[PDB]
Tab-separated table of N, CA and C in Angstrom:
chain	number	residue	atom	x	y	z
A	1	UNK	N	-32.662	19.288	-44.860
A	1	UNK	CA	-33.087	18.318	-43.861
A	1	UNK	C	-33.202	18.961	-42.488
A	2	UNK	N	-34.378	19.507	-42.189
A	2	UNK	CA	-34.619	20.093	-40.878
A	2	UNK	C	-34.528	19.021	-39.803
A	3	UNK	N	-33.819	19.332	-38.718
A	3	UNK	CA	-33.533	18.369	-37.664
A	3	UNK	C	-33.758	19.022	-36.308
A	4	UNK	N	-33.813	18.177	-35.282
A	4	UNK	CA	-33.729	18.602	-33.892
A	4	UNK	C	-32.890	17.568	-33.164
A	5	UNK	N	-31.774	17.998	-32.588
A	5	UNK	CA	-30.769	17.081	-32.080
A	5	UNK	C	-30.516	17.313	-30.598
A	6	UNK	N	-30.096	16.244	-29.927
A	6	UNK	CA	-29.664	16.295	-28.538
A	6	UNK	C	-28.340	15.558	-28.435
A	7	UNK	N	-27.358	16.185	-27.799
A	7	UNK	CA	-25.993	15.678	-27.762
A	7	UNK	C	-25.638	15.223	-26.355
A	8	UNK	N	-24.988	14.067	-26.258
A	8	UNK	CA	-24.438	13.565	-25.006
A	8	UNK	C	-22.937	13.403	-25.177
A	9	UNK	N	-22.188	13.760	-24.140
A	9	UNK	CA	-20.735	13.672	-24.147
A	9	UNK	C	-20.312	12.470	-23.316
A	10	UNK	N	-19.721	11.476	-23.968
A	10	UNK	CA	-19.249	10.270	-23.301
A	10	UNK	C	-17.771	10.450	-22.991
A	11	UNK	N	-17.417	10.338	-21.714
A	11	UNK	CA	-16.051	10.544	-21.242
A	11	UNK	C	-15.531	9.224	-20.684
A	12	UNK	N	-14.784	8.485	-21.498
A	12	UNK	CA	-14.185	7.232	-21.062
A	12	UNK	C	-12.900	7.542	-20.309
A	13	UNK	N	-12.800	7.042	-19.084
A	13	UNK	CA	-11.651	7.275	-18.215
A	13	UNK	C	-10.901	5.951	-18.102
A	14	UNK	N	-9.844	5.811	-18.895
A	14	UNK	CA	-9.052	4.586	-18.920
A	14	UNK	C	-7.981	4.684	-17.844
A	15	UNK	N	-8.271	4.162	-16.680
A	15	UNK	CA	-7.225	4.273	-15.679
A	15	UNK	C	-6.303	3.059	-15.729
A	16	UNK	N	-5.020	3.245	-15.425
A	16	UNK	CA	-4.045	2.135	-15.465
A	16	UNK	C	-4.086	1.284	-14.200
A	17	UNK	N	-5.005	0.326	-14.181
A	17	UNK	CA	-5.212	-0.508	-13.003
A	17	UNK	C	-4.164	-1.612	-12.978
A	18	UNK	N	-3.309	-1.588	-11.960
A	18	UNK	CA	-2.372	-2.664	-11.673
A	18	UNK	C	-2.733	-3.236	-10.312
A	19	UNK	N	-2.838	-4.560	-10.225
A	19	UNK	CA	-3.386	-5.216	-9.045
A	19	UNK	C	-2.561	-6.458	-8.744
A	20	UNK	N	-1.725	-6.374	-7.717
A	20	UNK	CA	-0.936	-7.501	-7.244
A	20	UNK	C	-1.507	-7.948	-5.907
A	21	UNK	N	-2.084	-9.144	-5.878
A	21	UNK	CA	-2.609	-9.723	-4.658
A	21	UNK	C	-1.676	-10.815	-4.176
A	22	UNK	N	-1.688	-11.069	-2.874
A	22	UNK	CA	-0.851	-12.110	-2.305
A	22	UNK	C	-1.667	-12.951	-1.335
A	23	UNK	N	-1.297	-14.222	-1.234
A	23	UNK	CA	-1.993	-15.185	-0.393
A	23	UNK	C	-1.048	-15.765	0.644
A	24	UNK	N	-0.231	-14.905	1.256
A	24	UNK	CA	0.666	-15.321	2.308
A	24	UNK	C	0.621	-14.342	3.466
A	25	UNK	N	1.259	-14.739	4.562
A	25	UNK	CA	1.313	-13.884	5.735
A	25	UNK	C	2.170	-12.655	5.460
A	26	UNK	N	1.778	-11.532	6.066
A	26	UNK	CA	2.564	-10.311	5.927
A	26	UNK	C	3.941	-10.469	6.556
A	27	UNK	N	4.015	-11.131	7.705
A	27	UNK	CA	5.266	-11.321	8.424
A	27	UNK	C	5.763	-12.744	8.210
A	28	UNK	N	6.986	-12.873	7.706
A	28	UNK	CA	7.657	-14.158	7.559
A	28	UNK	C	8.768	-14.208	8.597
A	29	UNK	N	8.692	-15.178	9.501
A	29	UNK	CA	9.559	-15.230	10.670
A	29	UNK	C	10.505	-16.416	10.579
A	30	UNK	N	11.799	-16.147	10.733
A	30	UNK	CA	12.826	-17.178	10.819
A	30	UNK	C	13.330	-17.201	12.255
A	31	UNK	N	13.160	-18.334	12.928
A	31	UNK	CA	13.546	-18.486	14.326
A	31	UNK	C	14.624	-19.557	14.378
A	32	UNK	N	15.879	-19.136	14.528
A	32	UNK	CA	17.009	-20.061	14.594
A	32	UNK	C	17.217	-20.454	16.050
A	33	UNK	N	16.674	-21.609	16.427
A	33	UNK	CA	16.774	-22.101	17.795
A	33	UNK	C	17.563	-23.392	17.928
A	34	UNK	N	17.801	-24.107	16.833
A	34	UNK	CA	18.511	-25.375	16.865
A	34	UNK	C	19.817	-25.275	16.089
A	35	UNK	N	20.749	-26.167	16.427
A	35	UNK	CA	22.046	-26.178	15.757
A	35	UNK	C	21.883	-26.530	14.284
A	36	UNK	N	21.049	-27.526	13.982
A	36	UNK	CA	20.797	-27.883	12.591
A	36	UNK	C	20.170	-26.729	11.824
A	37	UNK	N	19.379	-25.897	12.503
A	37	UNK	CA	18.804	-24.723	11.856
A	37	UNK	C	19.894	-23.759	11.407
A	38	UNK	N	20.917	-23.562	12.240
A	38	UNK	CA	22.047	-22.724	11.852
A	38	UNK	C	22.854	-23.372	10.736
A	39	UNK	N	23.077	-24.681	10.834
A	39	UNK	CA	24.036	-25.344	9.955
A	39	UNK	C	23.451	-25.511	8.556
A	40	UNK	N	22.273	-26.130	8.460
A	40	UNK	CA	21.668	-26.341	7.158
A	40	UNK	C	20.936	-25.127	6.630
A	41	UNK	N	20.512	-24.235	7.516
A	41	UNK	CA	19.736	-23.076	7.134
A	41	UNK	C	18.243	-23.349	7.177
A	42	UNK	N	17.480	-22.268	7.068
A	42	UNK	CA	16.027	-22.317	7.123
A	42	UNK	C	15.452	-22.062	5.740
A	43	UNK	N	14.495	-22.896	5.343
A	43	UNK	CA	13.800	-22.758	4.073
A	43	UNK	C	12.303	-22.776	4.327
A	44	UNK	N	11.594	-21.811	3.752
A	44	UNK	CA	10.141	-21.765	3.806
A	44	UNK	C	9.614	-21.781	2.381
A	45	UNK	N	8.884	-22.835	2.035
A	45	UNK	CA	8.414	-23.039	0.676
A	45	UNK	C	7.043	-22.411	0.481
A	46	UNK	N	6.891	-21.689	-0.624
A	46	UNK	CA	5.616	-21.069	-0.938
A	46	UNK	C	5.145	-20.097	0.120
A	47	UNK	N	6.054	-19.275	0.643
A	47	UNK	CA	5.670	-18.308	1.664
A	47	UNK	C	4.693	-17.280	1.112
A	48	UNK	N	4.903	-16.837	-0.127
A	48	UNK	CA	4.036	-15.856	-0.766
A	48	UNK	C	3.601	-16.384	-2.126
A	49	UNK	N	2.328	-16.164	-2.454
A	49	UNK	CA	1.754	-16.519	-3.749
A	49	UNK	C	1.186	-15.251	-4.370
A	50	UNK	N	1.871	-14.727	-5.378
A	50	UNK	CA	1.505	-13.474	-6.020
A	50	UNK	C	0.600	-13.760	-7.210
A	51	UNK	N	-0.599	-13.190	-7.180
A	51	UNK	CA	-1.534	-13.200	-8.292
A	51	UNK	C	-1.564	-11.812	-8.916
A	52	UNK	N	-1.658	-11.764	-10.240
A	52	UNK	CA	-1.369	-10.562	-11.011
A	52	UNK	C	-2.553	-10.223	-11.904
A	53	UNK	N	-2.914	-8.941	-11.942
A	53	UNK	CA	-3.833	-8.405	-12.935
A	53	UNK	C	-3.304	-7.053	-13.390
A	54	UNK	N	-3.331	-6.805	-14.697
A	54	UNK	CA	-2.724	-5.580	-15.195
A	54	UNK	C	-3.353	-5.171	-16.517
A	55	UNK	N	-3.619	-3.871	-16.650
A	55	UNK	CA	-4.104	-3.326	-17.912
A	55	UNK	C	-2.994	-3.259	-18.953
A	56	UNK	N	-1.808	-2.813	-18.551
A	56	UNK	CA	-0.706	-2.571	-19.468
A	56	UNK	C	0.318	-3.685	-19.316
A	57	UNK	N	1.260	-3.729	-20.255
A	57	UNK	CA	2.377	-4.653	-20.131
A	57	UNK	C	3.195	-4.309	-18.896
A	58	UNK	N	3.592	-5.334	-18.151
A	58	UNK	CA	4.152	-5.144	-16.824
A	58	UNK	C	5.422	-5.963	-16.662
A	59	UNK	N	6.277	-5.498	-15.757
A	59	UNK	CA	7.445	-6.237	-15.308
A	59	UNK	C	7.372	-6.359	-13.794
B	1	UNK	N	6.319	5.764	-13.445
B	1	UNK	CA	6.239	4.313	-13.341
B	1	UNK	C	5.201	3.892	-12.312
B	2	UNK	N	3.941	3.841	-12.734
B	2	UNK	CA	2.871	3.403	-11.848
B	2	UNK	C	3.079	1.948	-11.453
B	3	UNK	N	2.905	1.657	-10.164
B	3	UNK	CA	3.159	0.332	-9.615
B	3	UNK	C	2.034	-0.042	-8.660
B	4	UNK	N	1.996	-1.326	-8.310
B	4	UNK	CA	1.172	-1.831	-7.220
B	4	UNK	C	1.988	-2.884	-6.493
B	5	UNK	N	2.301	-2.630	-5.228
B	5	UNK	CA	3.284	-3.417	-4.506
B	5	UNK	C	2.675	-4.058	-3.267
B	6	UNK	N	3.232	-5.210	-2.901
B	6	UNK	CA	2.891	-5.904	-1.668
B	6	UNK	C	4.184	-6.181	-0.922
B	7	UNK	N	4.199	-5.892	0.375
B	7	UNK	CA	5.410	-5.954	1.180
B	7	UNK	C	5.298	-7.057	2.220
B	8	UNK	N	6.376	-7.816	2.390
B	8	UNK	CA	6.492	-8.808	3.450
B	8	UNK	C	7.668	-8.427	4.335
B	9	UNK	N	7.492	-8.587	5.640
B	9	UNK	CA	8.516	-8.263	6.623
B	9	UNK	C	9.165	-9.555	7.096
B	10	UNK	N	10.480	-9.650	6.930
B	10	UNK	CA	11.244	-10.820	7.346
B	10	UNK	C	11.933	-10.491	8.661
B	11	UNK	N	11.726	-11.336	9.666
B	11	UNK	CA	12.276	-11.137	11.004
B	11	UNK	C	13.124	-12.352	11.358
B	12	UNK	N	14.433	-12.250	11.153
B	12	UNK	CA	15.345	-13.334	11.491
B	12	UNK	C	15.690	-13.228	12.970
B	13	UNK	N	15.588	-14.344	13.681
B	13	UNK	CA	15.802	-14.396	15.124
B	13	UNK	C	17.066	-15.215	15.369
B	14	UNK	N	18.202	-14.528	15.443
B	14	UNK	CA	19.496	-15.183	15.608
B	14	UNK	C	19.711	-15.455	17.090
B	15	UNK	N	19.325	-16.646	17.541
B	15	UNK	CA	19.446	-16.946	18.960
B	15	UNK	C	20.807	-17.560	19.275
B	16	UNK	N	21.316	-17.350	20.491
B	16	UNK	CA	22.626	-17.905	20.892
B	16	UNK	C	22.539	-19.363	21.333
B	17	UNK	N	22.598	-20.264	20.359
B	17	UNK	CA	22.489	-21.692	20.636
B	17	UNK	C	23.834	-22.212	21.127
B	18	UNK	N	23.872	-22.660	22.378
B	18	UNK	CA	25.027	-23.339	22.951
B	18	UNK	C	24.582	-24.720	23.406
B	19	UNK	N	25.159	-25.761	22.810
B	19	UNK	CA	24.692	-27.130	23.001
B	19	UNK	C	25.864	-27.994	23.443
B	20	UNK	N	25.844	-28.411	24.703
B	20	UNK	CA	26.855	-29.295	25.266
B	20	UNK	C	26.205	-30.638	25.562
B	21	UNK	N	26.643	-31.678	24.862
B	21	UNK	CA	26.143	-33.022	25.073
B	21	UNK	C	27.200	-33.877	25.742
B	22	UNK	N	26.754	-34.861	26.513
B	22	UNK	CA	27.653	-35.799	27.163
B	22	UNK	C	27.161	-37.216	26.918
B	23	UNK	N	28.106	-38.146	26.834
B	23	UNK	CA	27.811	-39.547	26.567
B	23	UNK	C	28.314	-40.423	27.701
B	24	UNK	N	28.099	-39.974	28.939
B	24	UNK	CA	28.453	-40.751	30.105
B	24	UNK	C	27.332	-40.715	31.127
B	25	UNK	N	27.474	-41.558	32.145
B	25	UNK	CA	26.477	-41.613	33.202
B	25	UNK	C	26.472	-40.316	34.000
B	26	UNK	N	25.271	-39.886	34.395
B	26	UNK	CA	25.152	-38.686	35.215
B	26	UNK	C	25.799	-38.885	36.578
B	27	UNK	N	25.644	-40.069	37.160
B	27	UNK	CA	26.201	-40.381	38.469
B	27	UNK	C	27.475	-41.197	38.293
B	28	UNK	N	28.596	-40.647	38.750
B	28	UNK	CA	29.878	-41.341	38.758
B	28	UNK	C	30.181	-41.713	40.202
B	29	UNK	N	30.318	-43.008	40.463
B	29	UNK	CA	30.419	-43.530	41.819
B	29	UNK	C	31.811	-44.090	42.067
B	30	UNK	N	32.422	-43.672	43.173
B	30	UNK	CA	33.701	-44.201	43.631
B	30	UNK	C	33.439	-45.004	44.897
B	31	UNK	N	33.704	-46.304	44.844
B	31	UNK	CA	33.475	-47.202	45.970
B	31	UNK	C	34.833	-47.747	46.387
B	32	UNK	N	35.370	-47.227	47.488
B	32	UNK	CA	36.672	-47.650	47.998
B	32	UNK	C	36.448	-48.807	48.960
B	33	UNK	N	36.605	-50.030	48.454
B	33	UNK	CA	36.393	-51.228	49.254
B	33	UNK	C	37.671	-51.979	49.586
B	34	UNK	N	38.647	-51.997	48.685
B	34	UNK	CA	39.894	-52.716	48.891
B	34	UNK	C	40.994	-51.763	49.339
B	35	UNK	N	42.011	-52.336	49.985
B	35	UNK	CA	43.120	-51.538	50.500
B	35	UNK	C	43.866	-50.857	49.360
B	36	UNK	N	44.092	-51.581	48.261
B	36	UNK	CA	44.784	-50.996	47.117
B	36	UNK	C	44.026	-49.803	46.551
B	37	UNK	N	42.694	-49.807	46.648
B	37	UNK	CA	41.925	-48.642	46.224
B	37	UNK	C	42.256	-47.425	47.080
B	38	UNK	N	42.392	-47.621	48.393
B	38	UNK	CA	42.775	-46.521	49.270
B	38	UNK	C	44.193	-46.048	48.976
B	39	UNK	N	45.112	-46.987	48.754
B	39	UNK	CA	46.529	-46.637	48.689
B	39	UNK	C	46.867	-46.021	47.334
B	40	UNK	N	46.541	-46.722	46.246
B	40	UNK	CA	46.890	-46.227	44.926
B	40	UNK	C	45.896	-45.231	44.365
B	41	UNK	N	44.647	-45.296	44.810
B	41	UNK	CA	43.606	-44.413	44.327
B	41	UNK	C	42.766	-45.053	43.236
B	42	UNK	N	41.621	-44.427	42.980
B	42	UNK	CA	40.660	-44.900	41.995
B	42	UNK	C	40.629	-43.951	40.805
B	43	UNK	N	40.726	-44.517	39.604
B	43	UNK	CA	40.765	-43.757	38.364
B	43	UNK	C	39.760	-44.336	37.381
B	44	UNK	N	38.982	-43.462	36.750
B	44	UNK	CA	38.024	-43.854	35.725
B	44	UNK	C	38.295	-43.041	34.470
B	45	UNK	N	38.814	-43.702	33.439
B	45	UNK	CA	39.098	-43.053	32.169
B	45	UNK	C	37.837	-42.953	31.326
B	46	UNK	N	37.726	-41.857	30.582
B	46	UNK	CA	36.596	-41.668	29.690
B	46	UNK	C	35.260	-41.680	30.398
B	47	UNK	N	35.205	-41.123	31.609
B	47	UNK	CA	33.949	-41.099	32.350
B	47	UNK	C	32.900	-40.269	31.625
B	48	UNK	N	33.302	-39.129	31.065
B	48	UNK	CA	32.405	-38.269	30.307
B	48	UNK	C	33.056	-37.929	28.974
B	49	UNK	N	32.222	-37.735	27.953
B	49	UNK	CA	32.658	-37.395	26.603
B	49	UNK	C	31.826	-36.211	26.133
B	50	UNK	N	32.391	-35.014	26.227
B	50	UNK	CA	31.686	-33.778	25.923
B	50	UNK	C	31.788	-33.483	24.433
B	51	UNK	N	30.634	-33.351	23.788
B	51	UNK	CA	30.516	-32.875	22.419
B	51	UNK	C	29.920	-31.474	22.442
B	52	UNK	N	30.481	-30.580	21.634
B	52	UNK	CA	30.230	-29.150	21.746
B	52	UNK	C	29.706	-28.621	20.420
B	53	UNK	N	28.669	-27.787	20.485
B	53	UNK	CA	28.198	-27.024	19.340
B	53	UNK	C	27.847	-25.623	19.814
B	54	UNK	N	28.174	-24.614	19.009
B	54	UNK	CA	27.933	-23.249	19.447
B	54	UNK	C	27.884	-22.307	18.256
B	55	UNK	N	27.018	-21.298	18.356
B	55	UNK	CA	26.963	-20.251	17.343
B	55	UNK	C	28.126	-19.276	17.488
B	56	UNK	N	28.501	-18.951	18.722
B	56	UNK	CA	29.496	-17.925	18.993
B	56	UNK	C	30.762	-18.575	19.534
B	57	UNK	N	31.857	-17.820	19.480
B	57	UNK	CA	33.113	-18.279	20.056
B	57	UNK	C	32.939	-18.519	21.548
B	58	UNK	N	33.433	-19.658	22.024
B	58	UNK	CA	33.087	-20.144	23.348
B	58	UNK	C	34.334	-20.554	24.115
B	59	UNK	N	34.170	-20.648	25.430
B	59	UNK	CA	35.174	-21.200	26.326
B	59	UNK	C	34.515	-22.275	27.175
């Protein structure tokens, strides 16, 4: 079987892409200016929202 | 251990809250009209009632 062939080399580069995005401010500020602020403490709800994308199993 | 990290900076502002409240009239008036007021003197009990709150040890 006489042939004429042309070869291409396919190089798949599987990079380990881990991508953690956040939807909150970089700086979270606690300003204790009132007595009730000291006594009961300061709570900030949902300060950061982490969205996750990952190729591999992650912790 | 390949990672992808997002950092938040927490800045706690510990302010020196000193809170002195009073439950009396700002103006305390002594009206010496009768002779007995001059001789025995004028006394007002419970003129002011100081309530105290403070972050730090106080005097």
